[PDB]
Design a protein around this ligand. Structure first.
Ligand SMILES: Cc1cc(/C=C/C#N)cc(C)c1Nc1ccnc(Nc2ccc(C#N)cc2)n1
Ligand SMILES: COC(=O)c1c(N)c2cccnc2n(O)c1=O
Ligand SMILES: [Mg+2]
Ligand SMILES: [Mg+2]
Lengths: 416, 556
């Protein structure tokens, strides 16, 4: 009921980020949403003495038909002070990624019940553009904690801890983790029981609410205990061609950068001479042993891999074709913290960019569950193509950072 | 008296840490001072400025300027210093409408709102920063001190605050009259509609009555301005638009500046004149920026200019947007990285045109450039019409399918259909996915000395064919490309090539069809002639047979 003071980081002004072009349907959706938000006191019109801006657009959440406003507060979040006053930071729960089922709830609607510091409101300014700039864009700022702003869960945390208290005490084995507008709820129950607990959980928020959230009813189900990883595997063959052995030596040479003890001497010796690529080469005993020893090395964990919470996570993605995508998450090169592969890219069989956008969201979700922050993506796409289309397929309430890769990596061959 | 509503004041601040201006008033002639006193006396009578006491420490210089071919002086208050110290504002006008996105109107009326401007008050707390001083006759009395009560012409905040103030006043009128459009530019309101003229005039009178609620009057004697309108470099008519006349000058010789102006005009023309080209003229401007230098036009530039004169020989117009119809965008390849497009709804009735130029860089291909043009047109179309056009592209559906399924990057183009208008965009070569049975295998390598730039490139094959060429003025990376070129030259129509150059593989795997490097172009020319090419990579210095053999031949 009383506001928490907020400031920007020393020597920084507010965000001044251009609104990107919006389609007619998204503008109309935003005009309706913001008209209601204004009637409810959540936002207010602003005048020309506020020069700040943050981009806004609209999405449809997964399995819903109603438009959701999404503000891209990435710039404001970078510029906003850090929040360690009451707590140094909420230790990320290592048990969340170990639960049989995790359901993600959209609790962002809760933030609108808390007023925002009057002196900070100007920095949340945003614009609803008009088609062809024919009318002045509609300018608003927030009066309440905004969805997507890193300060909202931090300021709401004391309220959240009290709302959830009876449920946690009543269910001591449930793991509950908040990230931005998301609540991640993990348990080891049979799914039917699990959903009932999730539905039990919704009622606490609803009961609290009335003392109606548009997307609280929804539920994104995950199963992190079944999440799958990608060790390095070598072919098992009866007939090795010159080409096969060259590819193997290439892959082993690459793996030698990650694992020590990798040898290719005996395998390369097989290719002595100047041979046809399609010629079949019988493996010698020495080459078979060296291969077997390499296989044994690749079954072991990478040495000296640790997570440092002070460093960025980096995610690389490769297009493998036929709807398949590989990815790696690391902080230091050759020190992967997780690797993975998708082929299940939903409703996007003829759209590369929709597939990549869904891959980006899935990887970010995995990274939030495991480490409690989002990675910086290295995307195999031209900037202009990505920036034209990704908002059409985005369904999450957060947005990670990304950069673009313009030269094809050899590494695609080694994760293939 | 009829009560009028006040205009809400916009609160204004100086930039953090900055104080107001303290600039010396210049001495003036007795004649100039007398002129400024009379002018300021009238502004004071009208409420625009007020005399202030000696306590105010701020000052901005004031000047008197002779209104040409007249005996009347004008005042100029030079707010440059205050402007440096005044906060930034939201500037609503940054993005201007494109004519191609406007809708046809039966009637467009212009209302002069210059007088309303002086009903917009300046934030009371900011007024002190606008202080200025008329020097006194002979410097024998204190100068007359004034500050502004209204938005000063020339002050940083005036355009944004005026525009926002008018918009807020007009909002209920626009909202409750959805059958008109209202656009403000400078001191005029433009009101358009499709009503029969009697009803349209009724709406204008209703707007005037609405504006009177805030005491804002407009000139009864209707404006002298009427369609067509000259606006932002365009001509607007009720049912069509074009650019203002494009006149390319005749010259016996051309300077740097002349060519910059020519390309500027051509770029501007290219939004409605189809097929404008600027590559060869822009090539003349590479790297140098001495505006007076005379650059001889190349034969190619003279040809491009002649082609442009023919395109511009007579007027072309665009039509306006009909939201009930689809948008169609058609693209053609023009050569040398140039692309041209038209956007229309009905055949042969363009809304606008445009062009796209290849981005600068080492290598490219036509499919990538076509994709880039599509993305540019898509984004422009979202801006102008709020939707993506349906595309008509000079690329076969099967060509696109082969490209995107095999390309290492994610790529997408929205709904489109093939249009068979040459030259068509095609794939010029396709590398094999697997080694070729029965094709000779060429192991290539290169090396160069970093000091002398002497080097070697060559190959060895499984048939015992070999070649090493000594080279001058080369580098390690270049020799790797030269070695691949040799292998392509000396092999049959199907060939397996083994390289240890990650660099060379990275270039060829990017699938360029044209390059800034003549060597890469020669390689591309060779690839096009082959039936099948498999390019395999191996790590150097790992004891791989053929690779180690050729490495020894070129590194000695
Ligand atoms: C942007 C704009 C510039 C001017 C003009 C500024 C100036 N000078 C006048 C108006 C009324 C508008 N606003 C809109 C909005 C939607 N459709 C149109 N169509 C439209 C406008 C003018 C003519 C004409 N003649 C025909 C159609 N105009
Ligand atoms: C002593 O030689 C070398 O270390 C050597 C390289 N580092 C090398 C790197 C890329 C491509 N080709 C290469 N070749 O051919 C080499 O010989
Ligand atoms: Mg080499
Ligand atoms: Mg070598």
């Amino acid at each position: 009921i009383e506001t928490v003071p907020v400031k920007l980081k020393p020597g920084m002004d507010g965000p001044k980020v251009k609104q990107w072009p919006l389609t007619e349907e998204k503008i109309k959706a935003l005009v309706e949403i913001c008209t209601e938000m204004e009637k409810e006191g959540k936002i207010s019109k602003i005048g020309p003495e506020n020069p700040y801006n943050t981009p806004v657009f609209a999405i449809k959440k997964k399995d819903s038909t109603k438009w959701r406003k999404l503000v891209d507060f990435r710039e404001l979040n970078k510029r906003t002070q850090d929040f360690w006053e009451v707590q140094l930071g909420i230790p990320h729960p290592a048990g969340l990624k170990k639960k049989k089922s995790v359901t993600v709830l959209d609790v962002g609607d809760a933030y609108f019940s808390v007023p925002l510091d009057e002196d900070f409101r100007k920095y949340t300014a945003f614009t609803i553009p008009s088609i062809n700039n024919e009318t002045p864009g509609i300018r608003y700022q927030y009066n309440v904690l905004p969805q997507g702003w890193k300060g909202s869960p931090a300021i709401f945390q004391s309220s959240m801890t009290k709302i959830l208290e009876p449920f946690k005490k009543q269910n001591p084995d449930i793991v509950i983790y908040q990230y931005m507008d998301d609540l991640y709820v993990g348990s080891d129950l049979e799914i039917g029981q699990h959903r009932t607990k999730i539905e039990e959980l919704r009622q606490h928020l609803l009961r609290w609410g009335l003392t109606e959230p548009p997307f609280l009813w929804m539920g994104y189900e995950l199963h992190p205990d079944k999440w799958t990883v990608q060790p390095i595997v070598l072919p098992e063959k009866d007939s090795w061609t010159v080409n096969d052995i060259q590819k193997l030596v290439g892959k082993l040479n690459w793996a030698s950068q990650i694992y020590p003890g990798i040898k290719v001497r005996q395998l390369s010796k097989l290719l002595r001479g100047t041979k046809a690529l399609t010629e079949v080469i019988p493996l010698t005993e020495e080459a078979e042993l060296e291969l077997a020893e390499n296989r044994e090395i690749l079954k072991e964990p990478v040495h000296g891999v640790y997570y440092d919470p002070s460093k960025d996570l980096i995610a690389e993605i490769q297009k493998q074709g036929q709807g398949q995508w590989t990815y790696q998450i690391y902080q230091e090169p050759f020190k992967n913290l997780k690797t993975g592969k998708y082929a299940r890219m939903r409703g996007a069989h003829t759209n590369d960019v929709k597939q990549l956008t869904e891959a980006v969201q899935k990887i970010t979700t995995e990274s939030i569950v495991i480490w409690g922050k989002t990675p910086k993506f290295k995307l195999p796409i031209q900037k202009e193509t990505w920036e034209t289309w990704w908002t059409e397929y985005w369904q999450a309430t957060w947005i990670p950072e990304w950069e673009f890769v313009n030269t094809p990596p050899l590494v695609k061959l080694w994760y293939q | 008296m009829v009560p009028i509503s006040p205009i809400e004041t916009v609160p204004v601040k100086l930039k953090p840490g900055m104080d107001g201006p303290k600039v010396k008033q210049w001495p003036l002639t007795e004649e100039k001072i007398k002129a400024l006193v009379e002018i300021c006396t009238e502004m004071e009578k009208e409420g625009k400025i007020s005399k202030i006491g000696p306590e105010n420490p701020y000052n901005t210089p004031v000047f008197a300027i002779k209104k040409k071919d007249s005996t009347k002086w004008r005042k100029l208050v030079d707010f440059r210093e205050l402007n440096k110290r005044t906060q930034d504002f939201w500037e609503v006008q940054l993005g201007i409408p494109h004519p191609a996105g406007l809708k046809k109107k039966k009637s467009v009326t212009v209302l002069d709102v210059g007088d309303a401007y002086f009903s917009v008050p300046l934030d009371e707390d900011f007024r002190k920063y606008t202080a200025f001083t008329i020097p006194s006759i002979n410097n024998e009395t204190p100068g007359i001190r004034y500050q502004y009560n209204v938005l000063p012409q020339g002050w940083k905040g005036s355009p944004a605050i005026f525009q926002s103030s008018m918009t807020k006043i007009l909002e209920p009128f626009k909202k409750q009259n959805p059958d008109i459009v209202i656009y403000q530019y400078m001191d005029d309101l433009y009101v358009g509609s499709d009503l029969e003229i009697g009803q349209h005039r009724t709406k204008i009178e209703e707007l005037r009555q609405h504006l009177l609620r805030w005491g804002l009057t407009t000139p009864d004697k209707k404006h002298q301005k009427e369609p067509p309108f000259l606006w932002m470099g365009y001509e607007l008519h009720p049912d069509k638009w074009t650019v203002q006349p494009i006149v390319l000058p005749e010259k016996d010789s051309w300077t740097v500046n002349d060519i910059q102006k020519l390309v500027g005009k051509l770029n501007w023309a290219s939004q409605i004149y189809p097929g404008i080209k600027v590559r060869q003229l822009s090539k003349l401007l590479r790297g140098t920026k001495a505006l007076t230098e005379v650059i001889p036009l190349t034969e190619e530039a003279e040809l491009e200019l002649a082609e442009n004169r023919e395109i511009l020989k007579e007027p072309v117009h665009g039509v306006y947007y009909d939201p009930s119809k689809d948008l169609i965008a058609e693209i053609q390849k023009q050569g040398q990285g140039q692309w041209t497009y038209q956007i229309y709804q009905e055949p042969f009735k363009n809304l606008k045109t445009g062009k796209y130029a290849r981005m600068r860089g080492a290598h490219t291909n036509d499919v990538k450039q076509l994709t880039e043009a599509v993305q540019k047109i898509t984004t422009e179309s979202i801006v102008i019409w709020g939707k993506t056009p349906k595309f008509k592209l000079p690329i076969q559906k099967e060509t696109w399918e082969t490209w995107w399924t095999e390309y290492w990057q994610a790529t997408w183009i929205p709904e489109w259909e093939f249009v068979n208008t040459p030259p068509l965009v095609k794939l010029w070569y396709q590398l094999e996915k697997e080694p070729i049975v029965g094709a000779e295998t060429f192991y290539v390598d290169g090396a160069a000395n970093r000091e002398t730039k002497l080097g070697k490139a060559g190959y060895v094959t499984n048939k015992g064919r070999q070649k090493v060429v000594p080279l001058t003025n080369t580098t390690n990376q270049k020799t790797e490309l030269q070695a691949i070129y040799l292998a392509l030259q000396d092999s049959g129509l199907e060939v397996n090539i083994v390289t240890d150059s990650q660099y060379a593989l990275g270039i060829i795997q990017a699938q360029p069809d044209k390059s800034e490097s003549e060597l890469v172009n020669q390689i591309i020319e060779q690839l096009i002639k082959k039936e099948k090419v498999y390019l395999a990579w191996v790590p150097a210095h790992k004891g791989i047979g053929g690779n180690e053999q050729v490495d020894k031949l070129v590194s000695a």
